Amino acid sequence: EVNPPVP
Amino acid sequence: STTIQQNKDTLSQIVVFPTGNYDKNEANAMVNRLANIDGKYLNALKQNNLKIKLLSGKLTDEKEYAYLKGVVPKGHEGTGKTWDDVPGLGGSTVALRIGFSNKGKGHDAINLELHATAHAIDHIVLNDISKSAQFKQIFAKEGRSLGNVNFLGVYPEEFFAESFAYYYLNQDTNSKLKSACPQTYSFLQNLAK
């Protein structure tokens, strides 16, 4: 699983 | 002060520094901010052999993230940005670009390393609690009270990670979360018990 920061 | 040091000792077994030249003082500052996370979470990360990889360059230049080149991260539709340009990643792993901690440095998270690490805590330590029924009820009421409502108000795992970051970054952000999201604040408060 991967999750980015807030754009 | 002592649990801060204890958390830093735990992080010395989690944090991986990059090879070659990099900003040492800022790397240490990122670890210092991570040390504010409740020690119970950090010890869980350590037990799962989760590594917080600090990077001197793009995430996608690491072998394990090369598959994300050209890939638009979740919720980044229309930003024109791909994983090549994103300085932080969290989940099964954690990877962070040194120097991009602060809001505005290629992202709008309150703090890069806390946000990404919150994802790993959510996924590895808390078994995706952000997607549980309990938090989804809280996310439904307060998920749009921290700005970026089309990202935080849409993905509970992102609202959790960003709230987690507000809660642990510093005392100012902690107070802001309590006023804006009192039920989320209480949720994170109980989680740490």
> If DSSP codes are grouped into helix, strand and coil, which group holds residue B30?
helix
**How far from B151 is each of B17, B84, B144, B158, CA to CA, in Å?**
30, 20, 9, 7
Selection from B71, B70, B56, B37 nearest residue B161 by Cα: B37
> If DSSP codes are grouped into helix, strand and coil, which group holds residue B44?
helix
Does A6 contact B86 at a Cβ distance shorter than 8 Å? no
In degrees rounded to 5, what are phi and psi of residue B131?
-100, 5
Find the distance separating the first CA and the last CA of chain B, reported in whole Å: 19
- Give the resolution value in Å: 2.1
Reported as half-sphere exposure (CB side, CA atoms, 13 A), residue B153 has a value of 9
Dihedral, CA of residue B54, residue B157, residue B129 and residue B181, to nearest 10: 110
Of the candidates A2, A6, A7, which has its C-beta nearest B91's C-beta?
A2
Residues of B with a Cβ under 8 Å from any A Cβ are 68, 73-76, 79, 81, 83, 86-93, 107-109, 112, 115-116, 119, 123, 148, 151-152, 157-158, 161-162
Encoded tokens for B99: 């120097």
**How far from A3 is each of B33, B139, B171, B189, CA to CA, in Å?**
20, 17, 25, 23
Query: Can you tell me which residue has the tokens 């991967």?
Result: A2
Does A5 contact B157 at a Cβ distance shorter than 8 Å? no
Dihedral, CA of residue B185, residue B186, residue B188 and residue B192, to nearest 10: 140
Residues of A in contact with B109 (CB under 8 A): 5-6
Does B91 contact A5 at a Cβ distance shorter than 8 Å? no
Find the distance separating the first CA and the last CA of chain A, reported in whole Å: 18
Angle subtended by helix axes B2-12 and B39-47, to nearest 10: 20
Per the CB < 8 A criterion, the answer to whether A4 and B89 are in contact is: yes
**How far from B191 is each of B8, B19, B139, B186, CA to CA, in Å?**
21, 36, 15, 8
In degrees rounded to 5, what are phi and psi of residue B16?
-120, 125
**How far from B119 is each of B2, B7, B98, B179, CA to CA, in Å?**
26, 18, 18, 23
Encoded tokens for B51: 């590594």
Residues of B in contact with A6 (CB under 8 A): 107-109, 115, 148, 151-152, 158, 162
Long-range CB contacts (within 8 A, 24+) of B167-175: B168/B36, B168/B37, B168/B38, B168/B114, B169/B33, B169/B36, B169/B110, B169/B111, B169/B114, B170/B36, B173/B110
- Give dist(CA B63, CA B169) in Å, integer: 30
Residues of A in contact with B87 (CB under 8 A): 5
Task: Kindly give the pairing relationship between strand B15-16 and strand B52-55.
Answer: parallel
Selection from B117, B134, B137, B89 nearest residue B30 by Cα: B117
- Give dist(CA B67, CA B131) in Å, integer: 26
Cα B86 to its chain centre, rounded Å, is: 13
